[PDB]
Design an enzyme around this catalytic site. Structure first.
Site, mmCIF file in Angstrom:
data_model
loop_
_atom_site.group_PDB
_atom_site.id
_atom_site.type_symbol
_atom_site.label_atom_id
_atom_site.label_comp_id
_atom_site.label_asym_id
_atom_site.label_seq_id
_atom_site.Cartn_x
_atom_site.Cartn_y
_atom_site.Cartn_z
ATOM 1 N N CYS A 85 0.826 -1.206 0.000
ATOM 2 C CA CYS A 85 0.000 0.000 0.000
ATOM 3 C C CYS A 85 0.864 1.261 0.000
ATOM 4 O O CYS A 85 1.481 1.597 -1.011
ATOM 5 C CB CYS A 85 -0.949 -0.001 1.204
ATOM 6 N N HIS A 89 -3.498 -5.171 0.354
ATOM 7 C CA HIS A 89 -3.029 -5.675 1.640
ATOM 8 C C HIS A 89 -3.050 -7.197 1.704
ATOM 9 O O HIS A 89 -4.070 -7.790 2.059
ATOM 10 C CB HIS A 89 -3.879 -5.108 2.778
ATOM 11 N N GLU A 127 -1.604 -8.938 3.851
ATOM 12 C CA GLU A 127 -1.584 -9.333 5.258
ATOM 13 C C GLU A 127 -2.997 -9.538 5.798
ATOM 14 O O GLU A 127 -3.196 -10.249 6.785
ATOM 15 C CB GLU A 127 -0.840 -8.290 6.101
#
Length: 228
Positions: free
Chosen positions: A84, A203, A205
């Protein structure tokens, strides 16, 4: 241990990055954006991850990586993974440009993995500069012939990711490959071969990103050559 340095740019999803590395049994070290060279000069760092962040990368006062520290990673041949804001930090750091997206993105989003032989999977080429065709669109960018190492073993050429950004990379950094795009983000993921730099606008994650963990495995083990 084979340390993976995770730098914090203020992300609300920051600890999820540590979770991802824990899931694949990888020792991580967390520092902030302003990390100084003396603090990591004597670490066994195999890779660096730049987290996301709510701040504008072009606005004044925003968190940035020291030019001294960034170039240290390149000179030491330490692979960098930008997420990001982290991806946008890389662009700004290496002669790229970042503007506000004409259409921002939030939530689950499908991303097309790019090669020279699969550009016709882009059925939304007129979303960017009203390009006649996909061929015409990617004539302005450099594409790989083989799938990017970060996406090694992804089944389809499409991955579902979690989006959350109002800005986008409009000018790709020096000698970078364009390796992914979405409907509302042309430069969605980048790659530099000589410096082993990887960037993603989304993202991985976040668990909404179904192939996120696979990307963390590839970067840590296949790219950074870490031991368990």
């Amino acid at each position: 241990y084979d340390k993976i340095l995770v730098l914090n740019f203020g992300s609300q999803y920051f600890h999820l990055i540590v979770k991802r590395l824990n899931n694949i049994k990888i020792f991580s070290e967390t520092k902030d954006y302003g990390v100084e060279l003396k603090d990591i000069k004597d670490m066994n760092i195999k890779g660096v991850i730049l987290s996301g962040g709510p701040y504008s990368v072009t606005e004044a006062g925003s968190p940035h990586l020291k030019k001294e520290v960034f170039e240290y990673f390149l000179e030491k041949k330490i692979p960098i993974f930008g997420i990001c804001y982290g991806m946008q930090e890389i662009a700004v750091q290496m002669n790229g440009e970042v503007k506000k997206s004409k259409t921002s993105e939030y939530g689950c989003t499908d991303v097309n993995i790019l090669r020279n032989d699969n550009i016709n999977n882009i059925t939304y080429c007129r979303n960017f500069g009203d390009s006649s065709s996909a061929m015409d669109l990617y004539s302005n960018y450099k594409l790989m012939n083989e799938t990017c190492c970060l996406f090694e073993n992804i089944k389809s050429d499409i991955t579902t990711v979690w989006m959350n950004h109002n800005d986008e990379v409009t000018k790709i950094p020096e000698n970078f490959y364009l390796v992914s795009s979405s409907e509302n983000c042309l430069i969605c993921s980048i790659y530099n071969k000589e410096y082993n730099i990887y960037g993603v606008q989304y993202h991985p994650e976040v668990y909404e990103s179904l192939d996120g963990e696979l990307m963390f495995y590839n970067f840590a083990y296949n790219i950074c050559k870490c031991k368990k």
